[PDB]
Design a protein around this motif. Structure first.
Motif, PDB file in Angstrom:
ATOM      1  N   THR A  14      33.529 -10.807   3.667  1.00 60.03           N
ATOM      2  CA  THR A  14      32.997  -9.484   3.977  1.00 60.03           C
ATOM      3  C   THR A  14      31.486  -9.535   4.230  1.00 60.03           C
ATOM      4  OG1 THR A  14      33.192  -9.010   1.649  1.00 60.03           O
ATOM      5  CG2 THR A  14      34.955  -8.170   3.044  1.00 60.03           C
ATOM      6  N   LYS A  15      30.747 -10.191   3.326  1.00 59.22           N
ATOM      7  CA  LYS A  15      29.294 -10.175   3.392  1.00 59.22           C
ATOM      8  C   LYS A  15      28.727 -11.594   3.362  1.00 59.22           C
ATOM      9  CE  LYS A  15      30.712  -7.651  -0.106  1.00 59.22           C
ATOM     10  NZ  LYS A  15      30.766  -6.201  -0.423  1.00 59.22           N
ATOM     11  N   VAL A  28      12.104 -14.678  -3.147  1.00 60.26           N
ATOM     12  CA  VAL A  28      11.159 -13.738  -2.556  1.00 60.26           C
ATOM     13  C   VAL A  28      11.836 -12.918  -1.458  1.00 60.26           C
ATOM     14  CG1 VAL A  28       9.103 -15.123  -3.122  1.00 60.26           C
ATOM     15  CG2 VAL A  28      10.223 -15.416  -0.910  1.00 60.26           C
ATOM     16  N   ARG A  30      15.914 -11.202  -0.368  1.00 63.79           N
ATOM     17  CA  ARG A  30      17.330 -11.031  -0.608  1.00 63.79           C
ATOM     18  C   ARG A  30      17.824 -10.004   0.399  1.00 63.79           C
ATOM     19  NH1 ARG A  30      19.453  -7.296  -4.446  1.00 63.79           N
ATOM     20  NH2 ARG A  30      21.730  -7.337  -4.558  1.00 63.79           N
ATOM     21  N   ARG A  32      21.615  -8.758   2.633  1.00 62.36           N
ATOM     22  CA  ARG A  32      23.061  -8.833   2.761  1.00 62.36           C
ATOM     23  C   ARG A  32      23.469  -8.173   4.075  1.00 62.36           C
ATOM     24  NH1 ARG A  32      26.090  -6.238  -1.668  1.00 62.36           N
ATOM     25  NH2 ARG A  32      27.276  -8.129  -2.187  1.00 62.36           N
ATOM     26  N   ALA A  34      26.791  -7.754   7.096  1.00 62.94           N
ATOM     27  CA  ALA A  34      28.226  -7.772   7.317  1.00 62.94           C
ATOM     28  C   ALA A  34      28.585  -9.128   7.908  1.00 62.94           C
ATOM     29  CB  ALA A  34      28.571  -6.665   8.294  1.00 62.94           C
ATOM     30  N   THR A  35      29.648  -9.774   7.401  1.00 58.22           N
ATOM     31  CA  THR A  35      30.092 -10.997   8.056  1.00 58.22           C
ATOM     32  C   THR A  35      30.850 -10.643   9.339  1.00 58.22           C
ATOM     33  OG1 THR A  35      30.359 -12.107   5.926  1.00 58.22           O
ATOM     34  CG2 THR A  35      31.389 -13.147   7.823  1.00 58.22           C
ATOM     35  N   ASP A 294      25.700 -13.474  -9.537  1.00 59.16           N
ATOM     36  CA  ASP A 294      26.392 -13.647  -8.274  1.00 59.16           C
ATOM     37  C   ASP A 294      25.519 -14.465  -7.320  1.00 59.16           C
ATOM     38  OD1 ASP A 294      24.385 -11.809  -7.664  1.00 59.16           O
ATOM     39  OD2 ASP A 294      25.701 -10.328  -6.789  1.00 59.16           O
ATOM     40  N   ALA A 295      24.485 -15.170  -7.815  1.00 57.71           N
ATOM     41  CA  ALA A 295      23.492 -15.797  -6.955  1.00 57.71           C
ATOM     42  C   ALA A 295      23.614 -17.321  -6.863  1.00 57.71           C
ATOM     43  CB  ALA A 295      22.101 -15.433  -7.431  1.00 57.71           C
TER      44      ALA A 295
END
Ligand SMILES: Nc1ncnc2c1ncn2[C@@H]1O[C@H](COP(=O)(O)OP(=O)(O)NP(=O)(O)O)[C@@H](O)[C@H]1O
Ligand SMILES: Nc1ncnc2c1ncn2[C@@H]1O[C@H](COP(=O)(O)OP(=O)(O)NP(=O)(O)O)[C@@H](O)[C@H]1O
Ligand SMILES: CC(=O)N[C@@H]1[C@@H](O)[C@H](O)[C@@H](CO)O[C@@H]1O
Ligand SMILES: CC(=O)N[C@@H]1[C@@H](O)[C@H](O)[C@@H](CO)O[C@@H]1O
Ligand SMILES: [K+]
Ligand SMILES: [K+]
Ligand SMILES: [Zn+2]
Ligand SMILES: [Zn+2]
Ligand SMILES: [Zn+2]
Ligand SMILES: [Zn+2]
Lengths: 306, 304
Positions: A14-15, A28, A30, A32, A34-35, A294-295
């Motif tokens: 999805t992402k 520094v 981040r 996101r 849409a895939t 989640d990183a």
């Protein structure tokens, strides 16, 4: 000047998660996006844009590391990624190196996760670490003495594409057990049982309703009959499958990641149910939830170029 | 032939659900929210309706929960955390493309509606549904009926400014004043949401960590994360105490990404009393009973 900048991508169904890390390894950026799920030209665009934007903003050419759910063919570089249709069969590394005029490293999502989790000061000196992702799929990253084993053809830790063991099939009613088709085109792979998706599919199979995992868990928290029955079955199934895997790998630490790692009951139940299915002299590994939330994927991908 | 579709459109994720005549969920899809092109946004929604129409061989009713407000007069959308949809007549546009009626409703209202109809809450005089995700959203239910307000703005608690006691916690004239998608500034939307949790971390510590990452560090007892969580828990208690002094709800149901942070359910009851009136009694504070499906259910059952 800014110095060296390390970019990491964690590509999902999805992402696409992006991260930029400076020379101090401090995050520094981040983003996101849409895939893009149909056009590969669009897929390439999404990634390229993020690299460029960030290059502009920080005034550097950052290194590029990508974690993807599947395998880059060790010979052709073509990708086998069921959950990213746009990218299936493409030479992702070559294509990007072109468009971005620099080296690109590609690595499996679960390997990146395991790499980042294992480089934590608390795990860095462990003899072995198994990074396990339970999300859309089931994925494994194998670290021995601080180094990733990626295997003869980049398939090491593809535990999601091993078939249900006998003891698991017996739990699910043998010839009446649900046999789920797999994205790899085989049948009965654990990818479709122990993932968050699999948790959902197992609920649907027994109860004929398409609830989400969070929804099922909520019902379970309320003590609803169906959900209680499902969770009991699933906890036992998870213990059986992992006991099989731990009999082969015997890892010192297991780190869980992906959506389903948020289900806290896992960390209480696994230690209770694993012993019955392990060898009598087995000792449990330290089973822990991801330390980087989640990183781990993004971090692991970015630090390939360390 | 009766199929009810519900959408829960969020900052990051579009959730989709189809429910048959028995109200049993029979479909479940989850796309990324296209937040730049409105043509793409429309596409995402239209696709999921069509796919589902094909697969079940019916034309389902369409209910949508959106994070923002359809202008009560013009139908144009104000979606503070979706630049794409901003200014468009979403209902009109979709009724065109899908050749049938569409109902639009606020995400937090849908959530609250679904959570309130649970048998456990059904007779409560009031229920506040609170979403803490990309934004901060509220749904107000009184005697089982949604109050949506004079212009569909009821429960827009995310666009109220930080109260004095919250500003004092964050250093008064040195407090971070975050700009808002509504174009105001200091709106709680940017402080108490998952996004705001992140922005507050970044502001004090100069690192762009995600909420799950910060929480993980907190679980390990890392100094910065422990400091952040203490500040954030106090901030949350202060702001909610302000809101509960106005609304005094019987039950508060938390939803959105940040509702997964379990510490909230232990900390709020401890920290709220100091900031409420002396004779206040705490509402029942609970995590969503329908997990992440409250919004989808609420949206789909508008056409019920
Ligand atoms: N908090 C949660 N609790 C339980 N299940 C969850 C939670 N969040 C997500 N899931 C489930 O996890 C699945 C998706 O996992 P997720 O890890 O987000 O997949 P992905 O992003 O496609 N791939 P990847 O990030 O590499 O694992 C779905 O079945 C979700 O319902
Ligand atoms: N399990 C979790 N624990 C903590 N924070 C989370 C979790 N899952 C998501 N978040 C945070 O929640 C925020 C995103 O909100 P989320 O509800 O997941 O998506 P959304 O669709 O954009 N918002 P919404 O209007 O609630 O539906 C981000 O800050 C995430 O980091
Ligand atoms: C061949 C294939 O698609 N395998 C992937 C695996 O690489 C990944 O680690 C796991 C979790 O995302 O999902 C799938 O099992
Ligand atoms: C004006 C505006 O866009 N408000 C929205 C609100 O409707 C929504 O409920 C909340 C949670 O998603 O986020 C935003 O604050
Ligand atoms: K692997
Ligand atoms: K509202
Ligand atoms: Zn398989
Ligand atoms: Zn971290
Ligand atoms: Zn605002
Ligand atoms: Zn439910």
């Amino acid at each position: 000047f800014q110095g060296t900048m390390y970019y990491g991508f964690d590509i999902g169904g999805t992402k696409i998660e992006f991260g930029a890390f400076d020379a101090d390894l401090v995050r520094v950026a981040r983003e996101r996006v849409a895939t893009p799920t149909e056009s590969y030209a669009a897929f390439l665009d999404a990634i390229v844009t993020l690299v460029n934007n960030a290059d502009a903003e920080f005034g550097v050419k950052g290194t590029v590391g990508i974690g993807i759910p599947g395998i880059a063919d060790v010979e052709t570089g073509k990708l086998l990624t069921s959950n990213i249709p746009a990218a299936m069969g493409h030479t992702l590394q070559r294509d990007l190196e072109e468009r971005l005029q620099r080296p690109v490293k590609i690595e499996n999502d679960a390997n990146c996760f395991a790499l980042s989790e294992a480089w934590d000061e608390d795990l860095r000196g462990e003899p072995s670490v198994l990074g396990l992702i339970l999300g859309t799929g089931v994925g494994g990253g194998l670290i021995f003495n601080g180094k990733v084993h990626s295997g003869r053809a980049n398939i090491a830790g593809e535990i999601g594409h091993t078939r249900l063991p006998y003891d698991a099939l017996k739990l699910l009613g043998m010839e009446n057990a649900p046999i789920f088709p797999c994205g790899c085109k085989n049948s009965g792979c654990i990818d479709n049982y122990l993932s968050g998706r699999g948790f959902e599919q197992l609920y649907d199979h027994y109860f004929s309703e398409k609830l989400s995992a969070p929804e099922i868990i909520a019902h379970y928290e309320q003590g609803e009959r169906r959900a209680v029955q499902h969770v009991e079955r699933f906890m036992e199934l998870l213990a059986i499958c992992l006991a099989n895997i731990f009999t082969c790998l015997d890892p010192h630490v297991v780190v869980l990641g992906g959506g389903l790692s948020n289900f806290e009951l896992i960390y209480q139940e696994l230690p209770k149910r694993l012993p019955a299915h392990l060898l009598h002299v087995a000792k449990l590994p330290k089973i822990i939830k991801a330390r980087h939330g989640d990183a781990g994927g993004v971090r692991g991908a970015a630090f390939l170029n360390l």
